[PDB]
Design a binder for this molecule. Structure first.
Ligand code: HEM
Ligand code: HEM
Ligand code: HEM
Ligand code: HEM
Ligand SMILES: [K+]
Ligand SMILES: [K+]
Ligand SMILES: [K+]
Lengths: 154, 154, 154, 155, 154, 154, 154
C-alpha cells in the first residue's frame, strides 16, 4: 500500500467517524422533539456513513495499513433544526474537499481501486449536500413553522 | 393531404415541442427545490405533450408532409412557482387558440380525421388549463407558503 | 459548480436535444415506410437520449447552472435508410468528441461526479456507434434489399 | 290508503331532500372546481346519501298510495365560499331536522309506526351531518381558514 | 367561456334535471306495481341522466358560469305503462332538439370540447329513444298484457 | 330520419359490401398461393368491413330506412399481389371520397350521431390506406420477390 | 378440376351469398323490433352461411376455378316475423335442391371430396329447415303473440 494513500484513507475515515456520531445525535434530537420525519432521514444518513467507514477500514487493512478509529474530530452539534442542518452541510463541504484531495493522490500513484471507492463515497456525499441545500431552501420558501410541521409525521 | 392542413399540423407540433421542454425544465426545477409533488405533476404534463407530438408527427407523415422538429420557439421559463404556473398557462392559452384555427381549417377541407386528432389534443390542453387555473386559485385561498408546503411530498 | 463544467454540460445537453429529435423523426419515418424493426430500434435510441438529457439537466441544476433547452442545433435528416443511419453516425461522432473534451475538463477541476455521469453517457454513445457501424456493414454484406426486408417486422 | 297527513308530511320531507340533493351536489362540484377535493368528495357523498333517503320516501309514499311530489323544488342555499357553503348546508339541516320532528309526532299520533321508523333513520343521518358541519366550522376557527382549506385540497 | 354556450349548457342541464326526476318516479311506480324489469331499466335511465348532469355541471364551472340546478321544468308523469313510455319519449324528442341547437352554436364559436360532450349525451338520448320506440312497437306486436307479463321479473 | 342521410348511409353500406367480398376473395387467393400473412391480414380487413356494415344497417334501421343489401357493385379483383393491393387501394380512395360527402350532409342537417359513426368508419379506412401505400412502397424498396417471401409465413 | 363441378360450386356459393345477406338483415330487423332471441338465432344462421361460403371459395380455388362473388341473386325479405321465416324456408328449399344436383354431378365425375363438402353443407341446411318448420309450427300452436313474446329476451 502507498503510505500517503493510507493517510488519505485514514483521513476520510476520521471524517466519516465524525459524521456517524453527529448525524446519529441529530437524528435522536429530532426524535426527542417529535420531528420524526427528520429523525428517520438523519438516521439513514448516519447508517450510510457507517457503511462508508466499513469499506474504508476494509480497504486500509487490505493495503496493510492501520485503520485509525481512535481519533474522533469535532462534532458540530446544532441546537435547532436550521442550525443542525447547517452543521451537516458544513461537515459535508469539508468531507467533500478532503475526498477530492485523496482522489487526486490516488490517481497520481495509480491506485485506481482506492480512487473508485472514494468516488462512490463522494457521489453519496454530494447527494447529501443536495438534500441539505434543498431543506434550507424549503425553510425559506414555506416558512420555518410549516417546514417543521411537514416533518413531524414519518 | 391538404398543404395548409400540414402547415397547421406543423404549427401545432411546434407548440408541443415548446411545451415539452418548458414543462420538462419546470419539472426538474421544482424537484431541485424539493417541491416533488409539483415536479411529478409537471413531468407528467411534459410526457403528455410528448405523446401528442408523436401523433402529430405520424399524421403529418401519413399525409405526406414533412414534420418540422427543427424550429423551436420561445420557452417561457418562470423564476418561482407562481411565475412558472402562469408561464405554463400563457403557453396553453396560445396553444389552444392555434388548435381552434387548425380545426376550422380541417373542417373546411373535410379532413375529419385530422380534426378529430386535434380535438383530442384540445380537450387535453383544456384539462391542463383547468389544473393551472385551479393551482393559481389555490395559492390565493390557502396562501403561498401553505400551497408550497402541500407540494413538498409526492 | 465550475462555470466551464456547466458550459460543457449544456453543450452535451444541446447535443442530446438534437439527437432526441433526429432519432424520433427517423423512427417515425421508418414506421411510415413499414420498416418497423428499424423504427422501434430508433425509438429506443431516442428514449435513451431523453434519459441522458434528464440526468444532464438534474446535474446542471444541482451545480446551480441554468439548463439550456432553448437552443436547438441542426438536425441531420436523411431521406433513405442508408443516409439516415450515416446521419445518426455523424451526429454520434461529434457527440462523442464533445464528451471527451468535457471529461478532460471535469477531471482537471476535480468534479469527479460529473466526470462519472459523462463517462456513462459516453459508454452509451459508443454502444450506439457500434450498432450504426454494424448496420452499415450489414447493408454491404447482405445487400440493401435483404437488409431492408429484415427490418420490416418487429 | 295511508293517512293523508302522513303522506303530506312524507312529501314535505321529500321536498327537503330534493333541495339538499341539488345543493350538496353543486357545492361538491364547486369545491372540486377549486381544487378542494376532499371537501368535494365528502359533500358528494352527502348528496348521494340524501338521494337514498329520497328513494325510501318515494317508495313509502307509493306504498301508502299517495303521489310522490318531485315537481316542487324549494330554494337552494348556495354559498360563495367554503365558510358560507358549510353554513348554508347547516341552515338547511336545521330546517330539515325541525320538519322531521313534526312529521314523526304526527306519525305517532296516527299509529303509523313504520313511517315513524323511516323518519327516525333519516333524522339520525341528518343529525350526523349537523355534527360534521359544526365540527368543520369549529375547525376553521381552531386552525385558521387557510390551514383548513389546505387540509382539504387532497383526498 | 362564451355566454351563449353557457346558456345552452344550462338549458341541457335543465332537461337532464327533469329527466332524472321523471325517470326515477316512473321507475318506482313500475316497482310499486310489480313490473320490476321496467322498473330496473328506468332506474338505470335515471342514473345515466344524473351522470350527464354531472358532466354539464363540471363543464359549466370550468367555463366559469353558474350551474342552474334551481329551475325544474315540468315532469311528464304517465298514469299507465303505455303512457309512461310515451311521456319519456316526448321528453327525449325535446332534449334531442335542444342538444342539436346547442351543438350548432358550439361549432360556430369553436367550443369544440363542449360540442363533443354534447354529442356523447346526444348519442345516449338517441339510444334511449331506440329503446322507447322499440318498447311501444312491442306492445303492438305482442299485446299489452303479454308485454307487461314479460316485465314482471328482473 | 332525414331521407338523404339514409341515402348516404345506403351508399356507404354498398361500398362496404363490395369491400367485404373483394377483400375476402383476395384473402383466399393469397392463402391458395401460400402467402398466408397477406391472406390473414386481408381476412381481417374483410371482417372489419363486416363490422362497419353492421353498424350502418343498425343505424339505417333505427332511422326508419331500408337497408339495401341487394345491390352489389363492381368488385375490383387483381390477378397478382401488386394488382390486388392497388385494387384495394382504388376501392378505398372511392370509399373515402363517399364518406366525406356523407359527412357534409349529416353536419348540414344536424345528424351528429350519424356523422360520428361515419367518422369512425373513415378513420378505419384511412388506416387501411396507410397499410396499402406502405405495402406498395415496400415492394419497391425490398423488391417483389423479397416482399412476397416475407408474407409466406404468418 | 372438372368444369361443371366448378359451375355447381359457384352456384351453391351464390345461394350462400344470398342467405348471408338475407339472414343478416332479418337478424337486424328482429333486433330493431326488440325480438332479440330471434335476432341472435338468425345472426348465427348468417355466420354459418359465411363459413360455408368460405369452404366453397377455398375448394373452387383449389380446383383452379374463379369464385364468383359478384353476382348476387334475389334476397327474400319479409315484412314481418311470419313472412321472414317463410322467406328463409323458401330460400332453404331452393338451396337444398341445388345441393342435391351438385352432389349427383360430383358423384358421376368422381369428385368425392367435393361431394363430402356439399353433403356437410346439406346437412346443415336441413337442420335449418327443421328449425324453420318448427318455428312456423309453434306460431300455430302457441299463437303469434305468445311466440313473439317468447322471443323478446335471449
Ligand atoms: C465505526 C463506527 C461505526 C461503524 C463502523 C458502524 C457500522 C455499522 C454497520 C456496517 C451497520 C449495518 C448497517 C446496515 O448494513 O444496514 C451499522 C448499524 C447500526 N449502527 Fe453502527 N457503526 C458505527 C457506529 C455507531 C454508533 C456510534 C451508533 C449509535 C450511537 C450506531 C448505531 C447503529 C444502529 C442503531 C444500527 C442498526 C442496528 C440494527 O438494528 O440492526 N453505530 N453500523
Ligand atoms: C420530439 C421531442 C420529444 C418527443 C417526440 C418525445 C416522445 C416521447 C415518448 C413518445 C415517450 C414515451 C412516453 C410514454 O408513453 O410513457 C417519451 C418518454 C420520455 N421522455 Fe420524451 N419526447 C421528446 C422530448 C423529450 C425531452 C426534451 C426530454 C427531456 C428529458 C424528454 C424526457 C423523457 C423522459 C425522462 C421519458 C421517459 C423515459 C422512460 O423512463 O421510460 N423527452 N418521450
Ligand atoms: C332527483 C332526485 C334523485 C334521486 C332520487 C336520486 C337517486 C339516486 C340513487 C338511489 C343513486 C344510487 C346511489 C347508491 O346506492 O350508491 C344515485 C346515484 C347518483 N346520482 Fe342521483 N338521484 C337524484 C338526483 C341526482 C341529481 C340532480 C344529480 C346531479 C348530478 C345526481 C347525481 C348522481 C350521481 C353522479 C350518482 C352515481 C351514479 C354512478 O356513477 O353510479 N343525482 N341517485
Ligand atoms: C362474402 C360474404 C361473407 C363471407 C364469405 C363472410 C365470412 C365470414 C367469416 C369466415 C367470419 C368469421 C366467422 C367465425 O368463424 O366465427 C365472418 C364474420 C362476421 N361477418 Fe361475415 N362474411 C361475409 C359477409 C358478411 C356480411 C354481408 C355481413 C353483414 C354485416 C357480415 C357480418 C359479419 C359479422 C358481424 C361477423 C362477426 C365478426 C366479429 O365480430 O368477429 N359478413 N364472416
Ligand atoms: K400549514
Ligand atoms: K431474402
Ligand atoms: K303469455
Amino acid at each position: 500500500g502507498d503510505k500517503k494513500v493510507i493517510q488519505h484513507l485514514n483521513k476520510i475515515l476520521g471524517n466519516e467517524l465524525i459524521a456517524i456520531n453527529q448525524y446519529f445525535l441529530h437524528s435522536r434530537m429530532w426524535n426527542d422533539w417529535g420531528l420524526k420525519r427528520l429523525g428517520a432521514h438523519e438516521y439513514h444518513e448516519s447508517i450510510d456513513e457507517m457503511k462508508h467507514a466499513d469499506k474504508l477500514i476494509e480497504r486500509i487493512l487490505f493495503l496493510e495499513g492501520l485503520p485509525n478509529l481512535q481519533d474522533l474530530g469535532k462534532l458540530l452539534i446544532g441546537e435547532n433544526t436550521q442550525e443542525m442542518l447547517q452543521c451537516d452541510l458544513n461537515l459535508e463541504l469539508k468531507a467533500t474537499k478532503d475526498l477530492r484531495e485523496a482522489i487526486v493522490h490516488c490517481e497520481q500513484v495509480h491506485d485506481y481501486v482506492s480512487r473508485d471507492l472514494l468516488k462512490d463515497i463522494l457521489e453519496s456525499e454530494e447527494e447529501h449536500i443536495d438534500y441539505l441545500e434543498t431543506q434550507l431552501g424549503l425553510i425559506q420558501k414555506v416558512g420555518l413553522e410549516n417546514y417543521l410541521q411537514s416533518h413531524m409525521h414519518e
